[PDB]
Every structure is written in C-alpha cells, then in structure tokens.
C-alpha cells in the first residue's frame, strides 16, 4: 500500500493525443546519452515498450533538515521528503541538468550523486494528501528539483518530452516490485534457460551469422557464459511487471543484445522478431508445470534452478522443443524431456548485454548514415543527421568502461578488477564489437582529411571527424588490451 526505500519504481505521466490518453514512462540510456526521454506504454499489446531503461531505485528519502545535514559533510516515503533516484541499468542518478534543449532545464542522468541536482522533493497533488503523510501506491504527485526549484514536467514542439519547468505535471511512482521472495523468478529479470545439465541453453546465433540472428537454438558449451544466451522476461501486464511469475501467466521473452522477441510466425515458425511486429498473439508465452491440456508481488511459484518448466506459446498451444546445436521449434507434442530450468544472470553481465544492444544500435545508425552519402557529393548532405554527439559520448563512456585499474591499487583488488575487465571485454568481443568498431574506422578512413569528409557530409559534421576516428582507435585498443 505504501512506497518504501529500495523499491524499484517507474515514473509515469499521461498526455492526451488524438482524443485518447497515452501513458508514458521516464526513460534514459545513460551510456551514450544522459538525457531523459519518454517511453510510451499504452500500446503494449501491439508493441512492447523498452522498460529496462525505465526502472529506477529509491535510494533515499530524507526530510528537509536531513538533506541539509547530508550535504554539509528501509524507510517509508513521506510527503515533503527529498528522494534520490538511481537508474537501474546505468547506475547513474536522476538529476536536473544545467543545460536546456522558456526558462526550462533538461532532465537527465548524472555520474555522481553530489550536490542538490540529483534530489527531488515530493508534494501532494490534492487536499487528500498532506505534508508528513505516507506516500501511497497509485498516488498522483508533484516532484520539485531541489537545485532549480522547478517541477518535473511533461513538455510539448510536436513531440512528447521531459524537462524541469515552472509548469506542473502529475507523476505516478508506480512500483515495479517490492520486497520479493528470495530465489523466485520475477518479471524484468534477465536470465538463461537451460535444457538438462550438459551446459545446454536457449540462444540465438553469434553475430554476423547467415541467420541474420533470427533463429533460436539449443546450444552447448561456451554459449552458457556469452551475452547471446541472455533473455529478459516481460509479463504482458505492465502494472507490477516485476512481480513473481506464475504458472500459466502470459509473458514476452526478450533477447537482450538484439532487443528482439521470441515469436511464432505463419511463414517461419519459431523465430525472434522486431519489437514493432511483436504483437500479443505471436509473442505471448507461459511457463507450464506439465503438458496436461489447458496487484502486488503475489504468490511465489517459480524457483530459480529448482523449478522445471515447459514453455508454451499461448495462442497456439504449441510446446517449445528441439529439431551440439539443435534448432528450437514450436511443436504440438514436443518431447518428454522438454522441461527447462532458469538461472538468474548477475548485474555485471546483464548490464554489459544491454550496453552491447545500445552500442550496436547506435553505431549501425552511424554506419547507415555514412553509407547514405558514400558516392553522393554536396554543392545539402542531404540525408538524416549523423548522431555525432551520441557517438562521441558513447565512445568516451566505453573507453572509461574498459579502462584498466590504476597501477597504484593493491594486488588483491587489482587482480579482481583485471578479471572483471577481461570478462567484460570478452562479452563485447563475442558480440562482434571489434568488427563493428572497425567498420566505423574503415568507412571514415575512406576520406583523407576533414575537408574531404565535408564534401560528402556537412561542414558541421566534419568538425568532429578527426575526434571520432581517434576515439574509435582508442576504443579498439581498449577492447583488445590483454589485461592479464
């Protein structure tokens, strides 16, 4: 009934578009782009929203005097309290930025929780709540930046955005999960699906495969530690999507590094499909106890490791089965040994897998823009603008991410940090990040100078040509660095 600290939440607002209400969640990537944006959730039945980057953790909830004393150097939320919100993926903190996209400031994530910028005071939306009262689940609230004294605001030229404005917006701090039972599978969890005990898991193929990475397999060996075998369980009901999963409950299964959804198609059978084509009927599955014919955290039913689960496609009733590497299919009978167990991926690996997803998406966009004016000069590029700012920041972020530990650190800590670095390098390497970085280099090296690049791209885009190539070479080096 009440919101507490260390609860996972989403910040939701609503807007009227085409005489219909549209629910929107506060989202940010962090790496490559600090700025917050809005992720629509109303059309979930047709197109699944990108929720992994919508999740925030309530770090602290402090009174006015408690904040002031903290700046000089599980608790229930009360009105008047100032809260610190940590982004689940990037590990960064929601803040009011000093830059502007009007007397509004931009809203985004910052690297460190220092100063007032990352603090937001909670205020009642009506006379039904008062200062010092317990913040209840489902309450509309007003959020005020401690630094700028402005409201967290839904802005509208023709797009729906977030900023810090003197205009008010009502926000719903919807709980994703609360204290949940240990060892139980919940929504939003990133995991692996294992078949037997021979190091065999459900996966798509490696990068650059003739597959186009659309097919699903049972694969043995090194896959079991690679990013390509990681999946995100996404229940159809957005409310309490981070609640315990139940037998028979419909859910979508998202592939982390590609962002594609397990689906049944009329033409291809069992494949993995783009988000835009991942509608309920094709993409909805459930865990079953057997093959017999058939608003809170809820009852805990599915255990990690100990529970054996059959995967069923809901609309068709077909079972997930196999055709070492065996193709995964959907079949009316399947096989007697179809039952799978689940194992929870830890945060370093899951974080890395999402970073790869966004990194791949961004640089592939950058590559597509480069190919757009490949043999087309200007007298007016005139294709879509290259994501210069995002590419630069992405590059800088990954370089810092792959930075070796300081030689001044102690041996025990250094070795552990080196081991973590190697594992993180490996996950990127196995997802074809070297080739991808190289493809950017090779395409930019087609040009001899910045001025030559300006003859095909813009003069403004050419201003960052030398910087991007140098940062790419730097990332390339950091991806290879042995770090033994």
UniProtKB/Swiss-Prot annotation:
Detected in skeletal muscle (at protein level). Fast- or slow-twitch skeletal muscle. The N-terminus is blocked. Channel activity is modulated by phosphorylation. Residues 74-125, 132-176, 182-236, 242-297, 299-346 form the MIR domain. Changing residue 136 to C: Decreases threshold for channel activation by K(+), caffeine and 4-chloro-m-cresol. Decreases inhibition by Mg(2+). It is found in: Sarcoplasmic reticulum membrane. Changing residue 305 to R: Decreases threshold for channel activation by K(+), caffeine and 4-chloro-m-cresol. Decreases inhibition by Mg(2+). The calcium release channel activity resides in the C-terminal region while the remaining part of the protein constitutes the 'foot' structure spanning the junctional gap between the sarcoplasmic reticulum (SR) and the T-tubule. Pore opening is mediated via the cytoplasmic calcium-binding domains that mediate a small rotation of the channel-forming transmembrane regions that then leads to channel opening. Binding of [3H]ryanodine indicates that the heterozygous channel is activated by Ca(2+) concentrations 4-fold lower than normal. Single-cell analysis of cotransfected cells shows a significantly increased resting cytoplasmic Ca(2+) level and a significantly reduced luminal Ca(2+) level. Belongs to the ryanodine receptor (TC 1.A.3.1) family. RYR1 subfamily. Homotetramer. Can also form heterotetramers with RYR2. Identified in a complex composed of RYR1, PDE4D, PKA, FKBP1A and protein phosphatase 1 (PP1). Repeated very high-level exercise decreases interaction with PDE4D and protein phosphatase 1 (PP1). Interacts with CALM; CALM with bound calcium inhibits the RYR1 channel activity. Interacts with S100A1. Interacts with FKBP1A; this stabilizes the closed conformation of the channel. Interacts with CACNA1S; interaction with CACNA1S is important for activation of the RYR1 channel. Interacts with CACNB1. Cytosolic calcium-activated calcium channel that mediates the release of Ca(2+) from the sarcoplasmic reticulum into the cytosol and thereby plays a key role in triggering muscle contraction following depolarization of T-tubules. Repeated very high-level exercise increases the open probability of the channel and leads to Ca(2+) leaking into the cytoplasm. Can also mediate the release of Ca(2+) from intracellular stores in neurons, and may thereby promote prolonged Ca(2+) signaling in the brain. Required for normal embryonic development of muscle fibers and skeletal muscle. This is Ryanodine receptor 1. It comes from Oryctolagus cuniculus. The gene is RYR1. The chain holds residues 12 to 534 of 5037 of the full protein.
């Amino acid at each position: 009934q009440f919101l507490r600290t260390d609860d996972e939440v989403v910040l939701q607002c609503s807007a009227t578009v085409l005489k219909e209400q549209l629910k929107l969640c506060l989202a940010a990537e962090g790496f490559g782009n600090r700025l917050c944006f809005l992720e629509p959730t109303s059309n979930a039945q047709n197109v699944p929203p990108d929720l992994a980057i919508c999740c925030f953790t309530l770090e602290q909830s402090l009174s006015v005097r408690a904040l002031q004393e903290m700046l000089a150097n599980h608790r229930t939320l009360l009105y008047g309290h100032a809260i610190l919100l940590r982004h689940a993926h990037s590990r960064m903190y929601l803040s009011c930025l000093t830059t502007s996209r009007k007397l509004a400031f931009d809203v985004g994530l910052q690297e460190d929780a220092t100063g007032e910028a990352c603090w937001w005071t909670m205020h009642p939306a009506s006379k039904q709540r008062s200062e010092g009262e317990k913040v209840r689940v489902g309450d509309d609230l007003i959020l005020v930046s401690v630094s700028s004294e402005r409201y967290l605001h839904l802005s509208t030229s023709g797009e729906l955005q977030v900023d810090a404005s003197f205009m008010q917006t009502l926000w719903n701090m919807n709980p994703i999960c609360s204290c949940c039972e240990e060892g139980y599978v919940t929504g939003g969890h990133v995991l692996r699906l294992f078949h037997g005990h021979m190091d065999e898991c459900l996966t798509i193929s490696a990068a650059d495969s003739d597959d186009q990475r659309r097919l699903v397999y049972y694969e043995r060996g090194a896959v079991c530690t690679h990013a390509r075998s990681l999946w995100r369980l996404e229940p159809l009901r957005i409310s309490w999507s981070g609640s315990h999963l139940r037998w028979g409950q419909p859910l979508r299964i998202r592939h982390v590094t590609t962002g594609r959804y397990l689906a049944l198609t009329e033409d291809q059978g069992l494949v993995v499909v783009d988000a835009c084509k991942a509608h309920t009927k094709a993409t909805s599955f459930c865990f079953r106890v057997s093959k017999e014919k058939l608003e809170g955290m809820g009852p805990p039913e599915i255990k990690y490791g100990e529970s054996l689960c059959f995967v069923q496609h809901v609309a068709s009733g077909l079972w997930l089965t196999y055709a070492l590497k065996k193709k995964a299919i959907l079949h009316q009978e399947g096989h007697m040994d179809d039952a799978l167990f689940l194992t929870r991926c830890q945060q370093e690996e899951s974080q890395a897998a999402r970073m790869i997803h966004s990194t791949a998406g961004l640089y592939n966009q950058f590559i597509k823009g480069l190919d757009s004016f490949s043999g087309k000069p200007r007298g007016p590029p005139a294709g879509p603008a290259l994501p210069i700012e995002a590419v630069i920041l992405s590059l800088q972020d990954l370089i810092g991410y792959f930075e070796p530990p300081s030689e001044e650190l102690q041996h025990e800590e250094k070795q552990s940090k080196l081991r973590s670095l190697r594992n993180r390098q490996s996950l990127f390497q196995e997802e074809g990040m070297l080739s991808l970085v190289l493809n950017c280099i090779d395409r930019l090296n087609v040009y001899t100078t910045a001025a030559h690049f300006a003859e095909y791209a813009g003069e403004e885009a050419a201003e960052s040509w030398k910087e991007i190539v140098n940062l790419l070479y730097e990332l390339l080096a950091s991806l290879i660095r042995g770090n033994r």
